[PDB]
Amino acid sequence: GGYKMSKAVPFLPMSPALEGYVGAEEEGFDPMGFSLALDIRWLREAELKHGRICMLATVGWIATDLGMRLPGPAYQVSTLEAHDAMVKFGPMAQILIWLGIIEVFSFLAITNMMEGTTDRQPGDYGLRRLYPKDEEGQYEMQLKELRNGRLAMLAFSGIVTTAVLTGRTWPFXXXXX
Amino acid sequence: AETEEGLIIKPEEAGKITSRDKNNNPPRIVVKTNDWDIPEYQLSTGASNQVSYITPVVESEDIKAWLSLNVNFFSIIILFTVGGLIEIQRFFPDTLYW
Amino acid sequence: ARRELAVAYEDAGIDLMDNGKFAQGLVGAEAAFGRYEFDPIGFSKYTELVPWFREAELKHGRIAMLAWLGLVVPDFVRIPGEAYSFEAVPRVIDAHDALNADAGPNFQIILFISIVELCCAKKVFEWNSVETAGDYNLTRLFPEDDEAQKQMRIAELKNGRLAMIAFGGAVTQAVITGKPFPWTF
Amino acid sequence: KETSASVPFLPKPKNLAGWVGGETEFDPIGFSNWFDMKWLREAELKHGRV
Amino acid sequence: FAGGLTGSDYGGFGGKYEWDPVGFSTRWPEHLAWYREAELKHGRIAMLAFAGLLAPDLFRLPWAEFQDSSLDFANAHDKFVAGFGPMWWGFIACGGIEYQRFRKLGLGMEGLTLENAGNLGWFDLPKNSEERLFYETAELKNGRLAMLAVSGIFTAGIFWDQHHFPFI
Amino acid sequence: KIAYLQDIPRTIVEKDALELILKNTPKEQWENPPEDSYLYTVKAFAEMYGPGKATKMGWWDYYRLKMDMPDTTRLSSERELQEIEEYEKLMMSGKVPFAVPGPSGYFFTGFVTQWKGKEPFAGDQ
Ligand code: KC1
Ligand SMILES: CC1=C(C#C/C(C)=C/C=C/C(C)=C/C=C/C=C(C)/C=C/C=C(C)/C=C/[C@@]23O[C@]2(C)C[C@@H](O)CC3(C)C)C(C)(C)C[C@H](O)C1
Ligand SMILES: CC1=C(/C=C/C(C)=C/C=C/C(C)=C/C=C/C=C(C)/C=C/C=C(C)/C=C/C2=C(C)CCCC2(C)C)C(C)(C)CCC1
């Protein structure tokens, strides 16, 4: 009967920037009010980019720890030293160049979306594969992407911290604490 | 534009207008200050979840206009020229070819 | 009469008027034999901060109520493990010094308490009125009638005030004695 | 507001009418809007032949 | 200044002093009864405290637990309170007297005003009405002095390790 | 009397602080405080918040208001105002409170040496 109360934090009203967006109006989690201080479109873009980066990085860490390697003796290093070894090897610089060109295109997308020159949704790059045709299907698919991205972000955080703390491959089950 | 729904009211009706908003935020008092950098300071009447962005408003057009200023143009060109000279010196030191 | 934060929040903010009551008509003053409006230093005369002060009083009482129960239970049971055994940390008070910093236990408690506080901080400053001060929607056993709601509100405050004072003795008596739960010499 | 066929997340480049790649209009940076695109076509053709 | 309290007046080369250079009276006028009551009770105890430290050095009470040497003013407290001891005998006595003050002024000390403060009613020596004014100022002037005196006694005696009347 | 100085809530500014402001501010400026004068902010807010007006503020707006009002200690008291009103009177009357330079500064000697000579416009008299 009063404020549109946030579902996540029941004692804090939902921020108006969370209306009509993916995720958002199912949980409305924003107690610190970051959406009240920054554009919701930019926050959503950053969230989706972080989710995708983490979903790739978590699986990369899993594959590297479990023993999957490229057929080169230069890659016979642990996942912890993989970054430094490959930075000194060269491929990290090339990966950075390629991610740089892709991020130049992403920056153009953001600039042309925030200025309204295009009609782009925050995280949309045009890729429409396995995307439901029905609008509710699209909304719930975007929901699934967001949930998986957030889960992978937290999971990769834990994986990196535990791997550094205990020299051990991904499952960390044995360990000692 | 950014206050499409604020129920913005004038000082003369500080305690008269009560219709809150499309949200439930109470009406906000608009004070017309004479500063050009802050032409209007908005004052609240109660607790509200108002979206006030702290980010600036920049656009590609005037950022490019700033980079088109003679300082930026003649600094980028001279920086590239100096860097090219330094790179040539690294790659062909001591002008042995001469 | 416990308006839900959903609507109660519509009358929140720094009130610029005076109710005319002791502390803007807030619970905690009614004593046994009558009223015991206490404030002798006149902190409640700064009526703009009365919702804030009540929030601080409830927050302190809630921490102290757990904290006093904190110094009691380790003296009779401890978490199953060697780091918390009665031989590694004999008395309860030598726990902030033992389990802290690089150890991990206290540091994690600091972080997650920080996360909760940084999330529930907008309720302390915004959305905090003389009506919804300390109310975090967790009303399960709250009575429905107005007068009984006042008793439970009075019950929490008196218990919170008591624990605040009781915890002060608890650490002071324990530190000067190094003894189990009854901190008498 | 149409989008380019090549990069669908970017606005369709104006001044790129049908010359060759009119089906996959590809100018993210926007040199055609900054320069005389006839000169750009001449440079591209000379580069391709060379 | 501070109701009709006699802290000022008859106070030295000037007739009236009125020393309140923080405004603890004007800022909190409802507590002038409490402040006098506290100021007087502080003076009386301090005067008994100073006259205390000296007399044990000559006579000792017949309690036969206090009848022991080496109980100076730096160890008598922590020594007598036992596993109870003499210190509880004193504390219980102070409870008996302090309970009487409650009866005269009510439980919440509601009857405490700016004229009955520090007036337990023990009138044997005083006479007339102006002498009571003169004696009340003589009380405080002695009382305030001993409050600073015992303060210097306790600090100097235990810091410099004096423990006896010179306290030096 | 002046409209906005009546029934002003204590929460906006305290009574003693407001009286100190009114004393420090010259009388002619009460009706229309100039600008950048604490009284200007008092007018610009007391005409918005009060008994018949908006009785509530956001916490941040009230916080900023409390940092625009005087904090009861940055205002000259009556004796200081007398010091200024009399020092300026001495200086304009042609008399100088005699002072003597010292270690990077001057000690006031508590003497009124009549400064202007018999020819008040003469520089060497
Ligand atoms: C250095 C510390 C110090 C001591 C130790 C001290 C002591 C006493 N002062 Mg004193 N005093 C200052 C400092 C000290 N005074 C200062 C800085 C000032 C300037 C503001 C000042 C002014 C006055 C005035 C105006 C009066 C006064 C009083 C007394 C008094 C009471 C004696 C008696 O009445 O029993 C005693 C014992 C009254 C008076 O009687 O002086 C004889 C009174 O009228 N004082
Ligand atoms: C972190 C840390 C530690 C710690 C700690 C902590 C948290 C210590 C905390 C200490 C704490 C919390 C101390 C409170 C005191 C409160 C008091 C004294 C209140 C008195 C109040 C009094 C005396 C008066 C009360 C009343 O007047 C009132 C108000 C109204 C009247 O009607 C009734 C009466 C007269 C009764 C260790 C464990 C110690 C060591 C470790 O290594 C480092
Ligand atoms: C960072 C910073 C800072 C610092 C700064 C500085 C200190 C700077 C400097 C700078 C510099 C100081 C630089 C330099 C440079 C140099 C150069 C760049 C050189 C060049 C040269 C040339 C170019 C040459 C050429 C030639 C040749 C070789 C041959 C031919 C001829 C000629 C001669 C032409 C500060 C803290 C303040 C602040 C913050 C920021």
UniProtKB/TrEMBL annotation, chain B:
Residues the entry annotates as binding chlorophyll a: 87, 90
Transmembrane segments annotated in the record for this chain: 65-86
Protein known as: Uncharacterized protein
Lineage per the UniProt record: Eukaryota, Sar, Alveolata, Dinophyceae, Suessiales
Residues included from the entire protein: 474 to 571 of 571
